[PDB]
Amino acid sequence: EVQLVESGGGLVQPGGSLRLSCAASGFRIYSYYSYIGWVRRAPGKGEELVARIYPSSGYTYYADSVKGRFTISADTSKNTAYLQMNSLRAEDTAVYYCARWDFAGSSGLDYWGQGTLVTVSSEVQLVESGGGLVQPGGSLRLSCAASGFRIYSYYSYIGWVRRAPGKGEELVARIYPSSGYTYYADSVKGRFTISADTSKNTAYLQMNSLRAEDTAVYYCARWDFAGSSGLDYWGQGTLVTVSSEVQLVESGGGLVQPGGSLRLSCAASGFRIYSYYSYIGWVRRAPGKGEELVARIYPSSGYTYYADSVKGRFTISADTSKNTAYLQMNSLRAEDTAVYYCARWDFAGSSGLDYWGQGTLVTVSS
Amino acid sequence: WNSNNLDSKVGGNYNYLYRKPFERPLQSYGFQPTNGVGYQPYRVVVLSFATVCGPKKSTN
Amino acid sequence: EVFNATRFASVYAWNRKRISNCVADYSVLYNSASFSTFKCYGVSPTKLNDLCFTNVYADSFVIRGDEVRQIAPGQTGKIADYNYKLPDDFTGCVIAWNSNNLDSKVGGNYNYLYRLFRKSNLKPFERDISTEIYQAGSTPCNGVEGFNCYFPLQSYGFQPTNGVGYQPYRVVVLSFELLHAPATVCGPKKSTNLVKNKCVNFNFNGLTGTGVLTESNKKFLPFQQFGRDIADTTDAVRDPQ
């Protein structure tokens, strides 16, 4: 649970800068006066203290070798320590680690991160070549250079993939120079050999006794040591040729003569009227007017409410087995022409009409 | 204490209304005998807790 | 002048104000309700007004609210052990209040320092202002920081945005001293006239009892305040006025 988690290493041009980041997981920094710093181990050296930040005291302290160039900072909301390294030189190549010192009456650095390498020298790509035409029974050698990373020393493994015309990707071979092992797919075992030259930082695939069936675009791919994993970096490939919900849904509008009646119906989608105490009413908008309340029914409470303009003529009802609201409009007048819409009022403890229906037009005329 | 055979009514028993600890706008509950537990009424009695003592049990 | 002082000391270097030759009303401090903490040991905050004392000391400093609880007899912790301690035999008052509108700012008020690192724990009224880099490990520090080497005094980042535990609190600890010496401090207590040849109750500068306060010729030395019987009880007083 309690741990230091870090990332942000990589390659930086001398005179430039690189920033590292170490998250505090399982604990907070500011609120506990916990102090998080950075330590580095340059090739040929043991541990060297670089910097420490105490957000709770507002202070940063540095080692003499980095004073004037490196800045240590922290984000107390993100609970993360950062090291900003400016004006880096080749001499600053080191694995940088984050480490934890709690406030005291002695103390020390007991918690450590994993470390990440910062390379400062004068960005990752897999670069491959070696495709072309080979005759059946012959052989062809592919080569994939590791740019921006080191195959042996960073535990970044290189394999090969092929995609025959009409086919998807098939794994061919993998080499792990840091462990000294090679692996092959069943389809190439006994014919293909995978190798690497760690002084050139390059992986190779030697394909012997090639047949027409082995025509494919071959690709190189990177698989870092690793839980989950996958192939992130891919070469460009080369061709090897071997050859010789809530809505009130409504209907029921239309033309009715004055003195007659018309019935409208709203289907409740996305909710259930009776069981969730969701109450459905009707609102209308007459030509030349804005919205006017007509009626509200609460079938789960046995209540109806009406607007003054429709009282005595309109009746509101619902059928809880159909999850549908209805408006019965009797003794309609020309003045009642409107687009009628349903609206949903949940029980609360104030409330209001958030969800609305589609609407339908009711015309009353002779 | 379930009162589905006492308070619930087929057409709906709407005589019980609902809207700070122990405080004593409103809509009723649609209690119904043909519905599931959510709509079955319960007689709920809360005992808040000297003047009120239970029995002293005894023997021979 | 202490409680409403505009400036308090860093706790590692807490201040000590000497209160003497005055009338000490403590009911005005206690019932001001400006204090979150007003814990008097032995004698309650409003009863200690009946005691005179020759000296009262007000130890004045600023700490985080979560450390206020350490200013007590028998406690340990970064303040109780390295900045400001109280003795098990403490009969004084620990008074504290929120100063989140005085000793804090956005970005941090770092005016107040406290000690994290010390070779040993403090005696009850010890102060320690050393700037030597503390050696936690095996490597001599030789005056500088390094692995397992760290300067002992850090600021408190007091901000108005801190939760209450890390808001600053002003703490004043009142130590009240009762000596053989005549009082120089008395509470807000009115005197009356002397009565002789009658049985009376009495209070002479904090000394109480029942008896007949007759006049006498006991040859007290110029500095003596009280006399004694063969029973080693008080048998005479010098009138304090």
Add this chain to the structure above:
Amino acid sequence: WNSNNLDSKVGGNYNYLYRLFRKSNLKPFERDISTEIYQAGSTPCNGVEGFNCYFPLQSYGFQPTNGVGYQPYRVVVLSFELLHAPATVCGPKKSTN
């Protein structure tokens, strides 16, 4: 301690294995010697290696030519247990004349 003259050779000492994949982290003093193919991706492994499917263990290619961080180190951890059992492991007695 450094064992760069014991657990490494030119050409690689491959006598030591370590785990690169495990479904969850180990409990203190847990050991895990299973040999099932770990499924790193979504493709069912069905017991074999393939895309995003790996044998969970790996060898350490220890060579005397490795930089120090990759030279082999021998590690011994002393776990000291206080059980209901009699103490049996105690240092020397500070006796005198």
